[PDB]
Amino acid sequence: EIESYETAKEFYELAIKSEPDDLDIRVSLAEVYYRLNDPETFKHMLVDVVEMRKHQVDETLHRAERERIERERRITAKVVDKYEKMKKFEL
């Protein structure tokens, strides 16, 4: 979230080194590799994520407004922020 993508990669890899079982961690390194512009390791991670996701789906088959408003409000703040960034990018 801070865009300190090197430090993001460092702790996501430490998370895999400690618990390699969660695909949200795997997907997160894939997104960080995409942001770091590393398409070869990104493609390998995507293939592993997709095959293990197929395995999770197969295994699982064989085996609020008060909060929602703040999600929406955050999105509206992000829209306004990026629109004023666009107003600067136009110049």
Side-chain angles (χ1 to χ4, degrees):
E1 281 135 21
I2 287 163
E3 311 184 356
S4 59
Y5 294 119
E6 297 184 336
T7 63
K9 179 180 173 184
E10 287 168 0
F11 280 87
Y12 281 130
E13 285 189 315
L14 287 166
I16 290 179
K17 188 174 181 180
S18 46
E19 294 180 322
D21 305 335
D22 183 5
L23 293 187
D24 273 334
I25 312 169
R26 309 304 205 86
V27 166
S28 304
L29 294 80
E31 289 187 330
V32 170
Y33 299 165
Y34 169 80
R35 292 296 180 188
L36 290 172
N37 306 298
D38 295 330
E40 188 71 359
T41 184
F42 175 51
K43 185 175 179 179
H44 285 76
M45 184 63 70
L46 285 172
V47 170
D48 192 22
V49 163
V50 168
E51 74 187 336
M52 192 196 190
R53 183 57 178 173
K54 278 175 51 182
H55 302 165
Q56 286 188 340
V57 171
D58 292 348
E59 282 195 49
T60 52
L61 289 166
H62 291 306
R63 286 171 177 274
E65 179 60 9
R66 69 188 298 243
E67 299 189 325
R68 195 62 162 87
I69 185 66
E70 188 58 7
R71 184 178 173 86
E72 291 176 19
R73 182 163 164 266
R74 282 174 291 158
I75 293 170
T76 79
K78 187 167 62 181
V79 170
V80 172
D81 188 24
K82 293 189 177 189
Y83 175 48
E84 266 79 348
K85 290 181 178 180
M86 276 185 59
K87 177 171 266 296
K88 272 172 170 199
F89 284 121
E90 179 181 326
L91 181 59

